[PDB]
Amino acid sequence: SWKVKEIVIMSVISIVFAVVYLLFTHFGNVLAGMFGPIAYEPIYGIWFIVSVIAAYMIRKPGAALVSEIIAALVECLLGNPSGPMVIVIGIVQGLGAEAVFLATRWKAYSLPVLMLAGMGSSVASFIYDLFVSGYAAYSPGYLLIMLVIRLISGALLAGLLGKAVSDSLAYTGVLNGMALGKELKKKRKRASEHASL
Ligand SMILES: Cc1ncc(C[n+]2csc(CCO)c2C)c(N)n1
């Protein structure tokens, strides 16, 4: 059962990373223009990181989905050049990540599950692009290479990097009200019990 503070902290994270998303979107446009779509595939997973952060921190159903929606909304508001369609891909990416936490009953937050969640967004956004972003015009080889790159980027820049960011925050103390903060507390109590006089 969600707490007010969790809903609130999830929003602040979404908002902050909306700014990051927008910066990378600008990069991606320049890259696409110069070298074609494959050029932004390596950084693609950054646009999923909010889902992993919110889920790993809060560990309740809907975190991955809602956090990404809010981040996409705010990125749109801040001036994403593609307008509201970024909110659609945001919804799609959030559903892709959420599906992995659904599949593991919102009880599993090991790195492999976080990476899978990232990859879920990779797959969902790739489906979206085949409908909307002109990907259907490309060859099997090009598409296959881009999907593979996007899958790796989702695993690394959302899953792994998302865990690293979250852990770093947990170490500041600011997540002490959250599941991840509680986990750190438990681990620290365990480690403290090794002290001897
Ligand atoms: C929240 C969010 N913001 C920006 C992107 C970037 N983006 C939207 S569409 C498109 C081209 C088709 O892949 C790219 C690079 C994203 N994926 N998710």
Residue numbers in the entry: 3 to 199
From the paper:
They form a modular complex consisting of two integral transmembrane proteins, a T component, and an S component that form the conduit for the substrate, coupled to a soluble ATP-binding cassette (ABC) protein (Rodionov et al., 2009). The yko operon encodes for a group I ECF module, where YkoE acts as the substrate-capture S component, YkoC as the T component and YkoD represents the ABC component consisting of two fused ATPase domains.
We determined the structure of a thiamine-bound group I substrate-capture (S) component (YkoE), an integral membrane protein that is part of a dedicated tripartite transporter complex, in a lipidic environment. The structure was solved using single-wavelength anomalous dispersion (SAD) with selenomethionine-labeled YkoE to 1.95 Å resolution. YkoE possesses an additional C-terminal helix that presumably protrudes toward the cytosol and lies perpendicular to the lipid bilayer. The six hydrophobic helices form a tight fold with an open cavity with a volume of 545 Å3 facing the extracellular part of the membrane. The thiamine molecule is present at the base of the cavity found in the extracellular part of the membrane. In addition, the pyrimidine group is coordinated by H bonds by highly conserved Glu77 and Gln95 residues located on helix H3 and H4, respectively. The thiamine-binding crevice in YkoE is open and not protected by lid closure mediated by loop L1 as observed for several group II ECF S components (Zhang et al., 2010, Erkens et al., 2011, Zhao et al., 2015).
